Design a protein around this ligand. Structure first.
Ligand SMILES: [Mg+2]
Ligand SMILES: [Zn+2]
Ligand SMILES: [Zn+2]
Ligand SMILES: [Zn+2]
Ligand SMILES: [Zn+2]
Lengths: 56, 48, 10, 1176, 45, 56, 69, 53
DNA sequence: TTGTCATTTTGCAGGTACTCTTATTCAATATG
RNA sequence: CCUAAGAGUAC
C-alpha cells in the first residue's frame, strides 16, 4: 500500500491556489519558478530543431 | 501442489538469507535478527 | 465486530 | 459611591476581576501546583518508606560470633537550593534562565537530604527474642541525590521576587508569565492531564448481551501511601427478566467474583439482618429487600466468618498457601487490598462493611430505576493533574528506584565485607536523568505528549498553551458542567476536537490540603462516628463523606453546613475545599484533594435591611479595591484575598455548582420587578432564591476566545475557528525577542491595538502586545479576484508597511568529543584536506568558521563550518589522499530561505565544548498567497494586489486596504464581523475605543446613531467610485476599519516542485518532504481516479518512469530473479536450473523487486512467467 | 584577531583559536561576534 | 480527490506569482476554495501520456 | 513598535505627530478625538493610524544595549 | 546600528521620509544615467549619524 | 445409536494529502 | 540517516 499501489513520484509540484476570472476553463496558471523546475523531454525532430536549439 | 508447494516444505530446514539490498545499513533490524538466528543455531549445534 | 466495530464472527 | 452599603452595578464587577488578576495572574495554577510539590510533596515522598534496614544474621557456626547486626539508613529533611550550574572546570555558580536558554542548560536546582546511618547489634540466642541496641555510632551530613528542574517564576526561582527593573536587567520580559521548565535550553510546558476522580462510586448500566445488568465500581486510591490503583467492582448478575439476580464483588487478587454476603460475613457480620441493615437503610423499602434476597439465599451455605475467609482464600489466585493459613491470606486481602482508601490498618472492618453496603445500595438504587446511571462526562467527576502531581508520581517512582539501588549496594558491600561510603552509594544521575528525560521527551515514565515545547508564536498562543488540558483516549461533546471552567469554543478541529480543552479566564485548580482539620471540626461539631452507627435508630441521618471516605453520619446537616460555610468564609477552612449538601439523597460530601477545577462567584445573602436578596459586595469594597489599584499604579491594601477572607466571594467547583442557584447579572436578576427594540431579549427567570451571582458571564470564555469582538453575534463554529486561528496570528510574542535565540520568530513591523476591544483583553496584555492591524476593509464584488474566500490587498498599503514582518531563524551547532582526542573543531573547511564539503560557498565564513553578523546569506550557503577527525591513510574516490583527515560537518542555510545574518553566539555547553548559535533575519512582505483572517473565522488568501489608483475610492479619497467578497458573509453568518467594522469606524471617527465585549448592552442601533452623528450613512455604506473609470458604482459599498491577523501560512514556505532529486536508499523512490527536495505522493485513490479516466499509459508512466523503474532478469524455468547477469561479458546463468539460453529481462518497480525478494526471504516463491499456461 | 563582545559587560575582546571563550572583565561565558566591517546594502522599499 | 473530476488535464499558462491560478467554474469539481488550499500538478513525460491526457 | 511614518491607506505623513499627540494627551488633558482633530487627522484612516499605535520601542529601550560604546 | 530596530526596518522608515522635489525635473533617473551606481546628476546623498550620549 | 441444550473461549483495526520541531539511540558492572 | 512523539494546514 505504501510503495506499490501508491508511491512518491517525480515531476510533481504543489502550492497554494488562487482564482482568476481571466483564465479559460481548461487553463491553469503556473508560477514561473515551478515552470522552470518541472521539465518535459522533447525528442529532437526536424520539425522542432530550431526552437529546441533556442531553448538550449 | 506436487511441483510448487508440498506440505513438508512448510517446515523450515534452510533459511534463505536476503541480500544486503533487502536490509541496507547502523545495521538493519533484519541483520540483527539474522545474527540472533545464527547465534542460536551455533549454540544448538555446539550443544548437540 | 469488523474489525473494528472479526465479523461477527471470526 | 457616596453610600457605602449601596449595591454594585454590572460595571463594578470588572474591579473585582481586576483584583483577581492582580493576585492570581494567568498561569497561577502551574506555579501553585509546583510550589505545593516543592514545599510539601517532596518531603512526604522522602519520609514515607525510605528507611532501608538490612539485618545481617549471625550465621554462627560457632557460638563465639552469635551476634546479629542490623544496618539502617534513614532520610531526614530535604533541602532544595537555588538553581545553579556545574562547569567543565568544576566551578559552580548561580544559573539564570536567560543563560540556560542560550547555553542549552537545564534550569534545575540541586537536592540534598540529611542521611542518618544507624547500626544495631543483638545476641543471636535461639528461642530468646532478639533485642537490638545502639552502638553509639550515629553518623549523619547532607548528600546530593540529584537535581530538580525548576519552573520559572516559582517560589524557588530567581525571578519570583524580581521587580520590573530587575527583570529588564536579567534580560527577562516583564510580560513573561513563567510556569514552564527549561530543559536543555528548550521551554517545556506540562499539559494538564485529565483523569477520572478516585474514591467515587459510579454505577453503570450494561448492554443486553452481557449477563451483568448493572456494575457499581470505585477506583480506590490512597494519596499518602503506595499510590496504587485497585478497582473494586460490584456487579448485578441477571437481566431484568432473569430470576437469579445475585450480586457479586470483584476483589483484587481473586480469580472469581465473590458473592457480597460472603464478604460481609468475612468482615465480621454474620447475621442476615445486620447485613441487610448495612446494605438497606429503610425498612419500608421492600423492593430493595426483594431484589437483595437472592444474595442471602446464595450465601446461606456459609454461616461463619472463618468459613467465609477460607472460601475467599480458596478462591485466592496465589494457590501457594496451606489450608489453615488461607484465613490469614484472606485477612491480608481484606486489610491491605480491599478498599485501601478507607484504611490500611486492622480493626476497621465495620467501616469497610458499611462502605460495601453503601456501594450495593447505590447499585440497587440504579437498578430499581430510582436514579440514572452516572454520567462519565460530568466535569465534577474529573481531576486535572498539573505539574505538581505529575512530577510527584514521577519522582516517587524515581526515588524508589534510587533507594532500591542504595539497598542493593549496601547488601553487596556488606556481603563482600567492603567499606561503606555514602558518595559511592547514592547515584544522583538516576534522579537527574529520569527527570530530564521525562521533561525533555513527551513520554512520562521510566503516556506521551505530557510535556510539550512551549508555543512562542504569539503572546496569546503562549497563554493558551500554558492553560491547556489534554484527555487521554460522547467525551468530545461540550458538557453542561463545562460552564465557567473550560472555554466553550476553543478546541482543535482535528482528531483532538473536544479532547483538548482550555481553561476559562477565572478557573483555577485546587492544589490539595490535609483533611485532618476538617475531620476534627466534624467530630467536634457533632458528627457521629461510623463505628457505632445503627441505621434503624437514625433513619434520617445525613451521611458525611470526606474525600470519598464515609466518615460517619450527622443528625442536623443544616447547622453543620452553615457552620462549615462560615468557617470557610472566614478562612479557617481552606477556600479550595468544596462542600456539597445533597438534600434529596441526604448526603454531605467534602472534597479537599488536588485537581478539582473551580471558579469564583459573588455571594448573595438575605440582606434584611433591603428586605430582599442582594450581593454581599457593596460600593465600599469596590471603592477600596479601586483605591488599592490606583495606589499600585498610603492606605491599607485591599486585595482579592481580602474579599475571600471576608466572605465576599467564594470558590465553587462543579460538584458544589450542582447544589446552588446562580444569577447571571446582579443589576437585572437581584431586584424584584417601554423597552429598546434593538436590545436582545432577556428574561428574569421569575425566581428569587439565588445563592451566588456570576462575576461576569464573559468570563466563561478562554484566553483565545476573549479576543473575539462580539462573540455572541457569531455562529459558534466561527468562534471556534478564530480561537484555533489566533494562536497562529503574527505579532510580538515577547518584548525581549532581541536577546532570545529561538528556532523561529515572527514579528509584526507595526502591531496595532484593536479599535474594537473587549474588557477582558486588557488582562491578557493584548493592547500591549497586539497581533494584528486595523485595515480599511471594503466588502465588495469589485473585480472577481476575491471570490471563494480570496482577498484583494492594496499594494500601496503594503508598500507603506501594512502587515510587514520580521522573521528570525536560529541554527545551533556543537562540537562533540568523539573520543579522548577526537574533538570536533569549528573552522573554515579547505577543499585540499576535507571530505564531503557541500556545494554551497564557504567564502562568507571567516577564520573561526562563523559568518559575522550583517553578511547577506542566500540558500545553501554555509553558515557554520565544522570538521571532524577521521582515520587517515585511505585512498579511494579518485581524489582522496592521506591529507583528507577531516570530514566536513558544516551547517548550510535552508535551501528555500535567505536573509541577513543577525547575530551569532559562541559559548560552552555543559561538558565544556564550544558551541554556537546563528540567528538569521529576513523580512516577509505580504504577497499573493499569504493567509489573512479577521477575528471571526474569515480566513482567506490574497488573490491579487491593486495599487491605490485602481482601488475604488470614496468621495473623501479613502481607498480600502482590503477588499473581501460579500459572498463570505451570508452563509457563514458572521454578523459580528459587520458589527465590529461599524464599531471600529465609529471609534476611529470619535477617537474613543469600541467596547466589543460579548454580553454588554451595545446595540447596532446605537452605533449607527453615533455614526450618523459623525456625518456618515448610519449603516456603514459609502458611495464609492470605480478606480478605472471614476464613474460611481451603482451599489454602495460597506466600508470601514476591521482588525486582521496575518497568519503563519505564507505561500513562499509552501511552494515546492521536483523534477528529479534524491531517492530513498531502501525503496529507490523519491524522499519525503519539501525540506529534503522530496516528491509528491501519488496515492492509491489518485491511481483510482486515473483508472476511472481510463488512461492506462499515464498510470504506468506515473508508477514506473516517474518513481522507480528497475530492469531485472529472470529465467523461464523458475520465475525467480536468481539470474546471474554479467552484462559486459554478456553471460546470463541461473544456478540450479542450470540454464544459460532461457533468460528474460523485465521492467518492474524497484519496490516490486524488493517485495519479491522479501517474499523469497520469507519462504515464498513469487515465480514470474512471461507466457500463459492456461486459456482465459 | 577576531572580535567578540561579552553578553553582559558589553566589552570588546579579541579571541584566537586556542583562547577559551570567556570575558576577562567579568568571566561571562557567552560572547557575541562583532559586527562585520564590510558594507551592507539595503533597499529602502 | 474523491472522484475522477477531481483530477483533470489543464493547459499551462506561465504566470509571474507563486500560486496556481485556475478558473472559478472549475473549483466545484475540485471542491476547492482559496482559503489556503494547496493543489498538485503532474507533468506527463511522453507523447502517449500527453496525448491521452489531453484527449481523455 | 515605533510610530509609522505614513498612513497605510492614503499616505499622509503621521510619523511627526506622535510626540505632539502625547503632549496633547498629557499636558492639555485632551481626549483622544480632539487631539487627533487638532493635529489635522480628519480621515479615519490617519486617525486609526495614530490612535491605535502601540509604542513598544520603549520596552525595547529598557533592556541594556548589547553593543555599548 | 546598535539600536533596538532592525536595519531594514530603519531603511524602510527612511524610504518613507518625504523629501523636497521642487526641482526634481532637473534630476535624472538612475536607470538612464551613465554613472556606475549613483552620481550627482541622478541622486542625492544624505547621512544619518546619531549617538546616544 | 441419535438428537439436545447449555456454558466457556475466539479473534482487532480504524480516511487522503501536506508542513514544521524535538529527542534518542542500554547504563553499568566487569574483565583485558 | 533511521525511529518515535508532538503541534499544525486543506478536506
Ligand atoms: Mg478551503
Ligand atoms: Zn531458474
Ligand atoms: Zn563580561
Ligand atoms: Zn490616512
Ligand atoms: Zn548618475
Amino acid at each position: 500500500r505504501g510503495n506499490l499501489m501508491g508511491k512518491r513520484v517525480d515531476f510533481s509540484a504543489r502550492t497554494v491556489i488562487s482564482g482568476d476570472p481571466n483564465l479559460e476553463l481548461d487553463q491553469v496558471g503556473v508560477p514561473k519558478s515551478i515552470a522552470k523546475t518541472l521539465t518535459y523531454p522533447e525528442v529532437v525532430t526536424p520539425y522542432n530543431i530550431d526552437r529546441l536549439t533556442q531553448l538550449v | 501442489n506436487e511441483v510448487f508447494s508440498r506440505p513438508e516444505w512448510m517446515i523450515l530446514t534452510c533459511l534463505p538469507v536476503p541480500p544486503p539490498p533487502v536490509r541496507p545499513s547502523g545495521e538493519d533490524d533484519l541483520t540483527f535478527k539474522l545474527a540472533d538466528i545464527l547465534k542460536a543455531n551455533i549454540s544448538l549445534e555446539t550443544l548437540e | 465486530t469488523x474489525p473494528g466495530v472479526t465479523x461477527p464472527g471470526v | 459611591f457616596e453610600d457605602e452599603s449601596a449595591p454594585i452595578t454590572a460595571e463594578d464587577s470588572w474591579a473585582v476581576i481586576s483584583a483577581f488578576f492582580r493576585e492570581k495572574g494567568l498561569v497561577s495554577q502551574q506555579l501553585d501546583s509546583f510550589n505545593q510539590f516543592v514545599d510539601y510533596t517532596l518531603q512526604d515522598i522522602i519520609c514515607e518508606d525510605s528507611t532501608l534496614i538490612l539485618e545481617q544474621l549471625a550465621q554462627h557456626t560457632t557460638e563465639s560470633d552469635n551476634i546479629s547486626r542490623k544496618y539502617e539508613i534513614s532520610f531526614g529533611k530535604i533541602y532544595v537550593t537555588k538553581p545553579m550550574v556545574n562547569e567543565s572546570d568544576g566551578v559552580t555558580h548561580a544559573l539564570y534562565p536567560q543563560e540556560a536558554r542560550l547555553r542549552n542548560l537545564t534550569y534545575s536546582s540541586g537536592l540534598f537530604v540529611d542521611v542518618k546511618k544507624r547500626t544495631y547489634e543483638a545476641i543471636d540466642v535461639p528461642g530468646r527474642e532478639l533485642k537490638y541496641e545502639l552502638i553509639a555510632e550515629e553518623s549523619e551530613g547532607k548528600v546530593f541525590i540529584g537535581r530538580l528542574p525548576i519552573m520559572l517564576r516559582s517560589k524557588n526561582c530567581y525571578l519570583s521576587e524580581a521587580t520590573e527593573s530587575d527583570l529588564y536587567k536579567l534580560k527577562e520580559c516583564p510580560f513573561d508569565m513563567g510556569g514552564y521548565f527549561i530543559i536543555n535550553g528548550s521551554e517545556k510546558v506540562l499539559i494538564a492531564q485529565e483523569r477520572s476522580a478516585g474514591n467515587i462510586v459510579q454505577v453503570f448500566k450494561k448492554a443486553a448481551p452481557s449477563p451483568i445488568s448493572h456494575v457499581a465500581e470505585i477506583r480506590s486510591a490512597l494519596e499518602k501511601g503506595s499510590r496504587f490503583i485497585s478497582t473494586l467492582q460490584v456487579k448485578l448478575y441477571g437481566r431484568e427478566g432473569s430470576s437469579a439476580r445475585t450480586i457479586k464483588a470483584t476483589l483484587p487478587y481473586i480469580k472469581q467474583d465473590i458473592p457480597i454476603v460472603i464478604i460481609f460475613r468475612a468482615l465480621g457480620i454474620i447475621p442476615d439482618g445486620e447485613i441487610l441493615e448495612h446494605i438497606c437503610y429503610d425498612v419500608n423499602d421492600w423492593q430493595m429487600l426483594e431484589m437483595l434476597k437472592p444474595c442471602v439465599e446464595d450465601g446461606f451455605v456459609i454461616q461463619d466468618r472463618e468459613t467465609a475467609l477460607d472460601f475467599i482464600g480458596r478462591r485466592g489466585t496465589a494457590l501457594g498457601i496451606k489450608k489453615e493459613k488461607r484465613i490469614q491470606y484472606a485477612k491480608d486481602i481484606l486489610q491491605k487490598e480491599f478498599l485501601p482508601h478507607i484504611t490500611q490498618l486492622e480493626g476497621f472492618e465495620s467501616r469497610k462493611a458499611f462502605f460495601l453496603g453503601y456501594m450495593i445500595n447505590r447499585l440497587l438504587l440504579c437498578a430499581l430505576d430510582r436514579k440514572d446511571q452516572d454520567d462519565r462526562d460530568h466535569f465534577g467527576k474529573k481531576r486535572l493533574d498539573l505539574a505538581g502531581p505529575l512530577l510527584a508520581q514521577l519522582f516517587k517512582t524515581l526515588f524508589k528506584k534510587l533507594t532500591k539501588d542504595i539497598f542493593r549496594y549496601m547488601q553487596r558491600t556488606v556481603e563482600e565485607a567492603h567499606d561503606f561510603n555514602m558518595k559511592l552509594a547514592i547515584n544522583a544521575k538516576t534522579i537527574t536523568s529520569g527527570l530530564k528525560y521525562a521533561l525533555a521527551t513527551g513520554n512520562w515514565g521510566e503516556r506521551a505528549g505530557v510535556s510539550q515545547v512551549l508555543n512562542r508564536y504569539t503572546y496569546s498562543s503562549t497563554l493558551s498553551h500554558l492553560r491547556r488540558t489534554n484527555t487521554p483516549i460522547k467525551p468530545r461533546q461540550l458538557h453542561n458542567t463545562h460552564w465557567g471552567l473550560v472555554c466553550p469554543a476553543e478546541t482543535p478541529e482535528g482528531q483532538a476536537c473536544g479532547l483538548v480543552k482550555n481553561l476559562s479566564l477565572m478557573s483555577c485548580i485546587s492544589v490539595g490540603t490535609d483533611p485532618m482539620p476538617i475531620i476534627t471540626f466534624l467530630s467536634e461539631w457533632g458528627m457521629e462516628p461510623l463505628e457505632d452507627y445503627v441505621p434503624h435508630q437514625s433513619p434520617d441521618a445525613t451521611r458525611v463523606f470526606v474525600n470519598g471516605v464515609w466518615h460517619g453520619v450527622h443528625r442536623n446537616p443544616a447547622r453543620l453546613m452553615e457552620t462549615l460555610r462560615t468557617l470557610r468564609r472566614k478562612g479557617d477552612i481552606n477556600p479550595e475545599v468544596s462542600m456539597i449538601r445533597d438534600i434529596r439523597e441526604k448526603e454531605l460530601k467534602i472534597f479537599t484533594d488536588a485537581g478539582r477545577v473551580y471558579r469564583p462567584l459573588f455571594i448573595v445573602e438575605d440582606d434584611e435591611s433591603l428586605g430582599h436578596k442582594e450581593l454581599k459586595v457593596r460600593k465600599g469594597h469596590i471603592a477600596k479595591l479601586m483605591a488599592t489599584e490606583y495606589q499600585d499604579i498610603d492606605v491599607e491594601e485591599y486585595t482579592w484575598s481580602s474579599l475571600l477572607n471576608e466572605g465576599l466571594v467564594e470558590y465553587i467547583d462543579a460538584e458544589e455548582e450542582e447544589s446552588i442557584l446562580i444569577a447571571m447579572q446582579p443589576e437585572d436578576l437581584e431586584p424584584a420587578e417601554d423597552v429598546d427594540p434593538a436590545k436582545r431579549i432577556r428574561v428574569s427567570h421569575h425566581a428569587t432564591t439565588f445563592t451566588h451571582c456570576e462575576i461576569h458571564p464573559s468570563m466563561i470564555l478562554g484566553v483565545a476566545a476573549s479576543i473575539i469582538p462580539f462573540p455572541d453575534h457569531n455562529q459558534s463554529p466561527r468562534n471556534t475557528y478564530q480561537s484555533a486561528m489566533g494562536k497562529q496570528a503574527m505579532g510580538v510574542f515577547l518584548t525581549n525577542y532581541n536577546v532570545r535565540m529561538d528556532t523561529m520568530a515572527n514579528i509584526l513591523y507595526y502591531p496595532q491595538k484593536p479599535l474594537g476591544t473587549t474588557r477582558a483583553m486588557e488582562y491578557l496584555k493584548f493592547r500591549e502586545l497586539p497581533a494584528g492591524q486595523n485595515a480599511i476593509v471594503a466588502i465588495a464584488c469589485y473585480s472577481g479576484y476575491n471570490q471563494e474566500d480570496s482577498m484583494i490587498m492594496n499594494q500601496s498599503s503594503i508598500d507603506r508597511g501594512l502587515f510587514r514582518s520580521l522573521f528570525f531563524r536560529s541554527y545551533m551547532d556543537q562540537e562533540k568529543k568523539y573520543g579522548m582526542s577526537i574533538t570536533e573543531t569549528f573552522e573554515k573547511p579547505q577543499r585540499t584536506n576535507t571530505l564531503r564539503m557541500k556545494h554551497g560557498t564557504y567564502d562568507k565564513l571567516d577564520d573561526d568558521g562563523l559568518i559575522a553578523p550583517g553578511v547577506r546569506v542566500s540558500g545553501e550557503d554555509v553558515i557554520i563550518g565544522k570538521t571532524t577527525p577521521i582515520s587517515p591513510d585511505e585512498e579511494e574516490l579518485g581524489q582522496r589522499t592521506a591529507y583528507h583527515s577531516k570530514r566536513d560537518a558544516s551547517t548550510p542555510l535552508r535551501s528555500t530561505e535567505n536573509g541577513i545574518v543577525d547575530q551569532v553566539l559562541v559559548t560552552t555547553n555543559q561538558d565544556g565544548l564550544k558551541f554556537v548559535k546563528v540567528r538569521v533575519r529576513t523580512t516577509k512582505i505580504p504577497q499573493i498567497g499569504d493567509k489573512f483572517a479577521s477575528r471571526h473565522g474569515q480566513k482567506g488568501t490574497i488573490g491579487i494586489t491593486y495599487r491605490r489608483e485602481d482601488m475604488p475610492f470614496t468621495a473623501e479619497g479613502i481607498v480600502p486596504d482590503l477588499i473581501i467578497n460579500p459572498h463570505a458573509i451570508p452563509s457563514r453568518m458572521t454578523v459580528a464581523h459587520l458589527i465590529e467594522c461599524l464599531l471600529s469606524k465609529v471609534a476611529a471617527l470619535s477617537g474613543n475605543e469600541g467596547d466589543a465585549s460579548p454580553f454588554t448592552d451595545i446595540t447596532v442601533e446605537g452605533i449607527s446613531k453615533l455614526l450618523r452623528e459623525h456625518g456618515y450613512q448610519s449603516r456603514g455604506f459609502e458611495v464609492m467610485y470605480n478606480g478605472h473609470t471614476g464613474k460611481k458604482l451603482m451599489a454602495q459599498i460597506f466600508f470601514g476599519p476591521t482588525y486582521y491577523q496575518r497568519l503563519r501560512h505564507m505561500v513562499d514556505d509552501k511552494i515546492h516542485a521536483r523534477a528529479r532529486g534524491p531517492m530513498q536508499v531502501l525503496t529507490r523512490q523519491p524522499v519525503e518532504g519539501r525540506s529534503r527536495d522530496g516528491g509528491l505522493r501519488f496515492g492509491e485513490m489518485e491511481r483510482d481516479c486515473m483508472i476511472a479516466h481510463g488512461a492506462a499509459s499515464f498510470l504506468k508512466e506515473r508508477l514506473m518512469e516517474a518513481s522507480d523503474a528497475f530492469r531485472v532478469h529472470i529465467c523461464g524455468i523458475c520465475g525467480l530473479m536468481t539470474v546471474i547477469a554479467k552484462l559486459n561479458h554478456n553471460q546470463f546463468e541461473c544456478k540450479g536450473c542450470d540454464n544459460k539460453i532461457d533468460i528474460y529481462q523485465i521492467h518492474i518497480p524497484y519496490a516490486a523487486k524488493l517485495l519479491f525478494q522479501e517474499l523469497m526471504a520469507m519462504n515464498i516463491t513469487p515465480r514470474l512467467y512471461t507466457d500463459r499456461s492456461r486459456d482465459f | 584577531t577576531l572580535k567578540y563582545i561579552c553578553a553582559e559587560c558589553s566589552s570588546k575582546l579579541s579571541l584566537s583559536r586556542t583562547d577559551a571563550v570567556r570575558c576577562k572583565d567579568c568571566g561571562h561565558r557567552i560572547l557575541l561576534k562583532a559586527r562585520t566591517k564590510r558594507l551592507v546594502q539595503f533597499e529602502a522599499r | 480527490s474523491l472522484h475522477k473530476m477531481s483530477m483533470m488535464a489543464h493547459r499551462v499558462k506561465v504566470i509571474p506569482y507563486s500560486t496556481f491560478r485556475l478558473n472559478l467554474s472549475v473549483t466545484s469539481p475540485y471542491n476547492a476554495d482559496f482559503d489556503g488550499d494547496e493543489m498538485n500538478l503532474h507533468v506527463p513525460q511522453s507523447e502517449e501520456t500527453r496525448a491521452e491526457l489531453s484527449q481523455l | 513598535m515605533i510610530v509609522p511614518v505614513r498612513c497605510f491607506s492614503c499616505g499622509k505623513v503621521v510619523g511627526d505627530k506622535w510626540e505632539s499627540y502625547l503632549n496633547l494627551l498629557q499636558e492639555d488633558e485632551l481626549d483622544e478625538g480632539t487631539a487627533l482633530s487638532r493635529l489635522g487627522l480628519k480621515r479615519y484612516c490617519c486617525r486609526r493610524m495614530i490612535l491605535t499605535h502601540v509604542d513598544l520601542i520603549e520596552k525595547f529601550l529598557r533592556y541594556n544595549p548589547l553593543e555599548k560604546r | 546600528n546598535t539600536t533596538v530596530l532592525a536595519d531594514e526596518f530603519i531603511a524602510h522608515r527612511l524610504g518613507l521620509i518625504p523629501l523636497q522635489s521642487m526641482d526634481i525635473e532637473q534630476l535624472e533617473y538612475s536607470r538612464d544615467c551613465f554613472c556606475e551606481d549613483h552620481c550627482d546628476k541622478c541622486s542625492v546623498v544624505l547621512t544619518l549619524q546619531a549617538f546616544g550620549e
